[PDB]
């Protein structure tokens, strides 16, 4: 397909699942059992960009929803946000830079670095029920690695 994609869920290294907070926000919390179905399912698209054997550019949209994770400057600081897009023009092989992430395979974990803002990563807090955000520090208090689970689509 023009732009190839696959459906998946992500869990941070502390086994927290991701769920929709408001219409434009994601939160992370320890979920289990029935509640597991509340978790967000992503449509990860493999877009154009500088590629490596361990660094692959991707776009992260919500499955069946014209909403994509985007990195933009908000108050002079890199910020993560869910952005609405024209449902007929997305996804596409050549996504605007703010939608692109460098999927990095480390341990057996994944890290998502903003293509727009070097060394800024999708991160979660140690705390329960806090927003998913863009962090500029690795190996610290905040969590920056995840594992991915494939879903039947």
UniProtKB/Swiss-Prot annotation:
Q: What extra comment accompanies this record?
A: The IL1B production occurs in 2 steps, each being controlled by different stimuli. First, inflammatory signals, such as LPS, stimulate the synthesis and promote the accumulation of cytosolic stores of pro-IL1B (priming). Then additional signals are required for inflammasome assembly, leading to CASP1 activation, pro-IL1B processing and eventually secretion of the active cytokine. IL1B processing and secretion are temporarily associated.
Effect after changing residue 88 to E: Suppression of integrin binding. Markedly reduced activity. Markedly reduced activity
Instruction: Supply the name of the protein.
Output: Interleukin-1 beta
Tissue specificity here reads: Expressed in activated monocytes/macrophages (at protein level).
Q: What induces it?
A: By LPS. Transcription and translation induced by M.tuberculosis and a number of different M.tuberculosis components in macrophages; EsxA is the most potent activator tested (at protein level). In pancreatic islets, release is increased by high glucose treatment. In pancreatic islets and macrophages, release is also increased by endocannabinoid anandamide/AEA.
| GO cellular component annotations of the record | cytosol; extracellular region; extracellular space; lysosome; secretory granule
Annotated positions for site Involved in receptor binding: 4
Q: What does this protein do?
A: Potent pro-inflammatory cytokine. Initially discovered as the major endogenous pyrogen, induces prostaglandin synthesis, neutrophil influx and activation, T-cell activation and cytokine production, B-cell activation and antibody production, and fibroblast proliferation and collagen production. Promotes Th17 differentiation of T-cells. Synergizes with IL12/interleukin-12 to induce IFNG synthesis from T-helper 1 (Th1) cells. Plays a role in angiogenesis by inducing VEGF production synergistically with TNF and IL6.
**Source species, domain of life:** Eukaryota
Q: Which UniProt keyword terms apply here? A: Cytokine, Cytoplasm, Inflammatory response, Lysosome, Mitogen, Pyrogen, Secreted
The entry's family comment says: Belongs to the IL-1 family.
Q: Which organism is it from?
A: Homo sapiens (Human)
Effect on the protein upon substituting residue 105 to K? Enhanced integrin binding
The record places the site described as Important for interaction with integrin at: 55, 63, 65, 74, 88
Localization, UniProt: Cytoplasm, Cytosol; Secreted; Lysosome; Secreted, Extracellular exosome
What the record says about activity regulation is:
(Microbial infection) Cleavage by S.pyogenes cysteine protease SpeB promotes its activation independently of CASP1. SpeB-mediated maturation of IL1B plays a dual role depending on infection site: while IL1B inflammatory response prevents bacterial growth during invasive skin infections, it promotes streptococcal infection of the nasopharynx by disrupting colonization resistance mediated by the microbiota.
Subunit composition and interactions:
Monomer. In its precursor form, weakly interacts with full-length MEFV; the mature cytokine does not interact at all. Interacts with integrins ITGAV:ITGBV and ITGA5:ITGB1; integrin-binding is required for IL1B signaling. Interacts with cargo receptor TMED10; the interaction is direct and is required for the secretion of IL1B mature form. Interacts with HSP90AB1; the interaction facilitates cargo translocation into the ERGIC. Interacts with HSP90B1; the interaction facilitates cargo translocation into the ERGIC.
Extent of motif Involved in interaction with TMED10 C-terminus = 112-125
Query: Does the UniProt entry include the keyword Methyltransferase?
Result: no
Changing residue 25 to N: reported impact? Requires 2 nucleotide substitutions
Q: How is it modified after translation?
A: Activation of the IL1B precursor involves a CASP1-catalyzed proteolytic cleavage. Processing and secretion are temporarily associated. (Microbial infection) Cleavage by S.pyogenes cysteine protease SpeB promotes its activation independently of CASP1.
What parts of the sequence cross the membrane? none
GO BP of this protein: apoptotic process; astrocyte activation; cell-cell signaling; cellular response to interleukin-17; cellular response to lipopolysaccharide; cellular response to mechanical stimulus; cellular response to xenobiotic stimulus; cytokine-mediated signaling pathway
Report the leader peptide range.
Answer: none
Keyword Nucleus on entry: no
Give the result of residue 63 to E, as annotated.
Suppression of integrin binding. Markedly reduced activity
